[PDB]
Amino acid sequence: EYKTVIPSPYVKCCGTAECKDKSLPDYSCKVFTGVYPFMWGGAYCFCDTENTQLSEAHVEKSESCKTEFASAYRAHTASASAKLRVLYQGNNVTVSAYANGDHAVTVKDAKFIVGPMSSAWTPFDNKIVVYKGDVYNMDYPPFGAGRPGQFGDIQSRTPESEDVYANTQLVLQRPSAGTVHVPYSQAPSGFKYWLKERGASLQHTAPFGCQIATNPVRAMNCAVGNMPISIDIPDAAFTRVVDAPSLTDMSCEVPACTHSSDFGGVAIIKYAASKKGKCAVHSMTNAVTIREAEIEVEGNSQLQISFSTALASAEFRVQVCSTQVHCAAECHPPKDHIVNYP
Amino acid sequence: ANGDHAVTVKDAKFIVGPMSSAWTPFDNKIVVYKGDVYNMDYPPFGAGR
Amino acid sequence: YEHVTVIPNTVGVPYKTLVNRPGYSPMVLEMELLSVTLEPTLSLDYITC
Amino acid sequence: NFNVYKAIRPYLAHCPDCGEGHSCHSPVALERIRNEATDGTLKIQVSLQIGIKTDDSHDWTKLRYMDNHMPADAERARLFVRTSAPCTITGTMGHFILARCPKGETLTVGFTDGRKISHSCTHPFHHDPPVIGREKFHSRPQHGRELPCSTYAQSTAATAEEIEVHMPPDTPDRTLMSQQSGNVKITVNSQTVRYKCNCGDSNEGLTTTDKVINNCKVDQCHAAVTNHKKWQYNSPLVPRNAELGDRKGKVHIPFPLANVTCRVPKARNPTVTYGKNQVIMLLYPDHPTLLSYRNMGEEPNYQEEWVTHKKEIRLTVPTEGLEVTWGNNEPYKYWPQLSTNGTAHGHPHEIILYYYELYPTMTVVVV
Amino acid sequence: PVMCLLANTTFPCSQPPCTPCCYEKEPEETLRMLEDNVMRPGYYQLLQASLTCSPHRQRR
Numbered sequence: 001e002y003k004t005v006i007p008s009p010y011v012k013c014c015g016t017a018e019c020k021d022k023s024l025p026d027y028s029c030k031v032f033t034g035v036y037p038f039m040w041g042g043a044y045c046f047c048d049t050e051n052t053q054l055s056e057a058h059v060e061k062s063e064s065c066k067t068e069f070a071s072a073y074r075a076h077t078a079s080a081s082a083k084l085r086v087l088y089q090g091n092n093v094t095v096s097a098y099a100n101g102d103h104a105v106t107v108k109d110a111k112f113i114v115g116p117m118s119s120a121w122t123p124f125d126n127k128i129v130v131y132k133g134d135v136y137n138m139d140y141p142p143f144g145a146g147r148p149g150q151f152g153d154i155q156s157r158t159p160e161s162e163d164v165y166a167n168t169q170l171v172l173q174r175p176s177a178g179t180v181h182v183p184y185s186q187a188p189s190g191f192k193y194w195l196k197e198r199g200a201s202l203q204h205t206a207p208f209g210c211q212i213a214t215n216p217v218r219a220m221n222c223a224v225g226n227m228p229i230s231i232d233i234p235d236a237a238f239t240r241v242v243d244a245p246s247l248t249d250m251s252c253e254v255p256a257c258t259h260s261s262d263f264g265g266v267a268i269i270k271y272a273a274s275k276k277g278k279c280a281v282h283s284m285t286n287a288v289t290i291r292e293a294e295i296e297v298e299g300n301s302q303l304q305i306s307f308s309t310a311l312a313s314a315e316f317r318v319q320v321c322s323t324q325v326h327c328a329a330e331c332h333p334p335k336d337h338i339v340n341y342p
Numbered sequence: 343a344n345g346d347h348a349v350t351v352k353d354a355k356f357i358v359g360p361m362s363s364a365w366t367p368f369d370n371k372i373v374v375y376k377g378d379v380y381n382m383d384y385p386p387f388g389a390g391r
Numbered sequence: 392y393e394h395v396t397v398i399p400n401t402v403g404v405p406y407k408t409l410v411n412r413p414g415y416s417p418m419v420l421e422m423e424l425l426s427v428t429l430e431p432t433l434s435l436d437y438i439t440c
Numbered sequence: 441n442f443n444v445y446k447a448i449r450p451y452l453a454h455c456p457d458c459g460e461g462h463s464c465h466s467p468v469a470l471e472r473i474r475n476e477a478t479d480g481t482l483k484i485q486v487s488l489q490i491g492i493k494t495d496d497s498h499d500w501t502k503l504r505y506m507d508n509h510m511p512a513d514a515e516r517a518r519l520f521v522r523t524s525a526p527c528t529i530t531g532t533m534g535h536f537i538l539a540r541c542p543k544g545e546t547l548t549v550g551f552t553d554g555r556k557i558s559h560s561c562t563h564p565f566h567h568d569p570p571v572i573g574r575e576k577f578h579s580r581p582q583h584g585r586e587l588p589c590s591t592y593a594q595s596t597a598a599t600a601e602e603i604e605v606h607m608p609p610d611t612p613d614r615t616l617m618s619q620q621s622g623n624v625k626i627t628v629n630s631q632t633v634r635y636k637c638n639c640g641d642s643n644e645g646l647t648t649t650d651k652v653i654n655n656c657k658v659d660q661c662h663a664a665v666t667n668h669k670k671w672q673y674n675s676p677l678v679p680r681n682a683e684l685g686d687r688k689g690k691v692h693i694p695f696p697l698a699n700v701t702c703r704v705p706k707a708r709n710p711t712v713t714y715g716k717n718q719v720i721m722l723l724y725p726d727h728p729t730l731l732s733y734r735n736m737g738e739e740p741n742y743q744e745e746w747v748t749h750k751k752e753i754r755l756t757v758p759t760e761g762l763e764v765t766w767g768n769n770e771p772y773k774y775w776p777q778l779s780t781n782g783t784a785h786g787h788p789h790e791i792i793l794y795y796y797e798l799y800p801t802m803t804v805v806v807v
Numbered sequence: 808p809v810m811c812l813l814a815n816t817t818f819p820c821s822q823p824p825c826t827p828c829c830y831e832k833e834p835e836e837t838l839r840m841l842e843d844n845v846m847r848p849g850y851y852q853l854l855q856a857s858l859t860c861s862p863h864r865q866r867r
C-alpha cells in the first residue's frame with residue numbers, strides 16, 4: 001500500500017514564491033492565486049488580496065509494507081517430491097523422496113529408487129502473484145510498465161527496493177472558500193479493489209485435484225501419470241517353497257460377487273496345503289483385487305477370502321504360492337451409490 | 343533489456359529492448375565454483391555415484 | 392521523434408541516428424552500448440564440498 | 441520514558457467540515473484513517489494527544505486540545521466515536537485511536553470541553569469496513585474455529601515513522617488590539633505578537649508589550665502571536681510557517697501491525713444424497729456464505745456463488761467424482777459408483793442396459 | 808557513538824552540546840535539532856535524552 005504525503009503548504013501572503021522542482025514519486029506542485037488564509041481571529045494574514053499559496057503533494061510507501069504486501073513472482077520449472085509407506089512384511093516404514101527417477105534412498109535393506117514422473121505438466125505459469133495465504137496465475141503488468149488503479153498501481157522490486165513506480169495524477173484544486181487546506185483529485189488504487197475480488201484462489205482452480213500449499217508454495221496431490229519404483233530386496237525375505245505347503249486341489253467358490261468399487265465379492269478356496277506355512281496369494285490379472293496378501297495356511301480345508309473387481313463376471317487365475325487356482329465369479333450390479341474414496 | 347523498464351532522463355524517454363536473439367550459454371544442471379560455472383550433469387541427490 | 396530503431400548488439404559502436412522531425416531542424420544523435428548483462432535463474436540445487 | 445509532549449509544535453486547527461454542512465474552529469478533528477488490519481480494527485489520527493498531557497501523566501481526565509492559543513483539557517470518558525453506529529473504542533494513545541465498528545456513510549468523534557459542553561467533529565467519511573474469510577455473525581462468538589489474519593499490534597515501540605510537526609504559521613488573535621482614541625494598544629499579555637499594520641510609525645514587526653500603534657484602528661492593525669512556548673499539533677493540511685522551508689516533523693508513531701488468528705465462525709454441514717450419476721445437496725444456511733465446486737480432471741470447471749437459504753442444489757457428477765468446498769470446512773470429496781442395476785441375462789438380450797450402467801449409452805452406437 | 812552534526816561539531820548523538828533537556832533550556836535550538844539531526848537514528852536516543860523523560864527535571 002502507498003501513502004499520499006503532503007507538506008504543510010506555503011501561505012505566501014502579499015506575493016508569490018515559486019516552488020522547487022524536486023523529484024519525488026508523483027511530485028506535484030501548484031501555487032494557487034488570490035488565496036484567503038483563515039484562522040481563529042478571522043483571516044490569518046492582515047494582507048488579504050495578494051495572498052498566494054504554494055501547495056505540494058507526493059506519494060511514497062506506507063507503513064503496512066513491512067509484513068502486508070503482495071508479490072508478482074516469475075514462476076519456473078517444478079521440482080517433484082513424493083511420500084511412500086511400505087508395509088514391509090507387517091512393518092510400516094515411510095520415506096519421502098524426489099519422484100523423478102533420480103532420488104535413491106536406502107534404509108532397512110530397501111533400495112528405494114523411484115522412476116520418472118511420467119507426466120510433465122505444471123499447474124503454474126511464470127506470471128504468478130502471491131499474497132500471504134494464496135497465489136493467482138494472472139498476467140500482472142511488469143515493473144515500470146504498471147497501470148494506475150490495478151495491479152501495478154504502485155510497483156517496487158523488493159520492499160527494501162525504494163524504486164516506487166507510482167501512478168496517481170493527484171491534481172490539486174483551489175480550496176472551497178478561504179479554507180486552509182489542499183484538495184486533490186481522483187486516484188483509485190489496486191489494493192482498494194482487487195484484494196476484494198481476486199476471488200477463486202488456485203487452490204480452487206486446480207485441475208486433476210491439485211492442491212496448493214504456501215511456505216514455499218507447491219502443487220501437492222495431483223497424482224497424474226504412472227510412477228515406477230525399482231526396489232531391490234535380498235534373500236533375507238524369500239523362503240523356500242519346501243518351507244511352504246504345496247497347496248493342491250484348489251477350487252474357488254464365489255457365493256456373492258457384485259462388480260463394485262468396494263469389496264466386490266467373497267470367495268472360498270478349497271485347498272490342500274501339505275503342512276503348516278505362510279505363503280502368498282496373487283491374482284494373475286490386475287482387475288480383481290484380493291484384499292488378503294500373505295496368508296498362513298494349515299492343511300486340507302477351505303480358506304475364505306474376499307476380492308474386489310468391477311468385472312461383470314470375474315473369471316481369472318490366482319497364483320496361490322506357486323500353485324495355480326482358476327476362479328470364476330458371476331458378479332452382480334452394484335447397489336451402493338456414492339463412494340468417498342476412488 | 344527486456345522491453346518492460348521505461349526510463350526518462352532530462353525528459354528524454356526510452357524503453358529499451360527486448361533482446362532479439364534470446365540465446366543462452368547456460369545448461370540447467372550447472373555447477374558453480376568461486377569464480378566459475380560449468381555445464382556438467384552433477385549426479386542427482388540421493389542417486390550419486 | 393518517437394524514433395524506434397534497432398541498433399546492432401555491439402558494445403562500443405557509435406550509432407548515429409537521424410531525427411528529421413517534421414518540418415523541423417535535423418538532428419543526428421549518438422548512442423553507444425556499454426554493457427550487456429544477462430543473469431539467468433538463481434536456482435541453487437544442492438552442494439558438494 | 442513516556443514523553444511525547446515537547447516534540448509537538450503549535451500549528452493550530454480549524455475543522456473544515458465539523459458537521460451540519462459548515463465548518464468551525466475545532467482542534468479535535470479527524471485527518472487520517474488506517475483500515476489495513478485484515479480483521480477490521482480501525483486506526484485513526486487525531487490532532488490531540490491522549491493518554492498523555494502537558495506534564496505527561498496517564499490520566500484520562502485531561503487532553504491537550506487547542507482553543508485559541510490555549511491548552512485546554514477534556515475527559516477521556518467523553519470519546520464519542522461513531523460512523524453510523526457508535527464505535528467500540530479500544531486504543532487511546534497520543535495520535536492514535538483504535539476501534540472496531542460497522543459500515544457507515546460518515547464518521548465523527550465527540551469530545552467534552554473545559555466548559556464541559558460536548559461537541560463533535562463530524563466529517564462525511566465513507567469508511568467501509570472490509571470483509572475477511574467466508575463467514576458473518578448474528579450473536580457474539582465464544583465458540584468458534586481458526587482463521588489466520590492480521591491486526592494492529594499494540595506496541596509503543598514503532599520508531600522511524602513520523603507525522604509532520606512544525607512551528608506555527610501564527611496565532612492571529614483580533615482580541616489583543618484595544619483602541620485608545622484612534623490608536624491601538626496591542627495587549628500582548630505574556631505572548632510574542634507579530635503586528636502587521638497599514639498605518640504610520642509601526643507597520644510590521646514583533647512586540648512583547650502592549651504597544652501603542654497611533655493613528656491606527658482594529659481593521660488597520662494585526663495581532664499575530666508567534667507561538668514558541670506552548671506547543672500542540674495538527675495535520676499538515678493546514679499551512680506552514682511561511683518564512684522559510686519546513687520545520688521537520690519528528691515524532692515516532694506507535695502501534696504497528698502483525699499477524700494473528702481469529703475465532704472465526706464455522707460453517708454448518710449440509711445434507712446430501714446420491715442419485716443416478718448425480719448428487720442432491722440440501723443446505724442448512726446460516727447467513728449469506730459463498731460456495732464453490734469443481735471436478736478432478738483436465739480442467740476443474742470450478743463454479744462459485746454465494747448461497748443464502750435452505751438450498752437444495754442438484755449437481756451431476758462426472759466419472760472423476762466431485763469436489764464441493766462449502767465454508768472453510770473440509771473440502772467435500774465424492775466419487776461415482778455405477779448406480780442401480782441393468783437387468784438379468786434371461787430369454788431377451790437384456791445386456792444393453794447392463795451396458796447402460798457400464799459405460800452407459802456410450803460406445804453403444806458401435807454395436 | 809553515532810555521530811550527530813549540528814553543522815559545526817561532530818558530536819555523539821548521546822552527547823549533544825546540551826546534555827540533557829534541550830527544550831527545557833532552548834525551544835528553537837531543539838527545533839533546529841529537529842530539522843537537522845533527524846538524519847541520525849541515534850538522535851532518537853537523544854529524543855530519549857531530551858524528549859522522552861530523561862531531563863534534569865526528573866529527580867533521577
Ligand SMILES: *[C@@H]1O[C@H](CO)[C@@H](O)[C@H](O)[C@H]1NC(C)=O
Nearest residue numbers: 085086087088090091092093
Ligand atoms: C500398516 O499399514 C497398513 C496399510 O499400509 C494399515 O492398514 C495398517 O493399519 C498399518 N499398521 C500399523 C501398525 O501401522
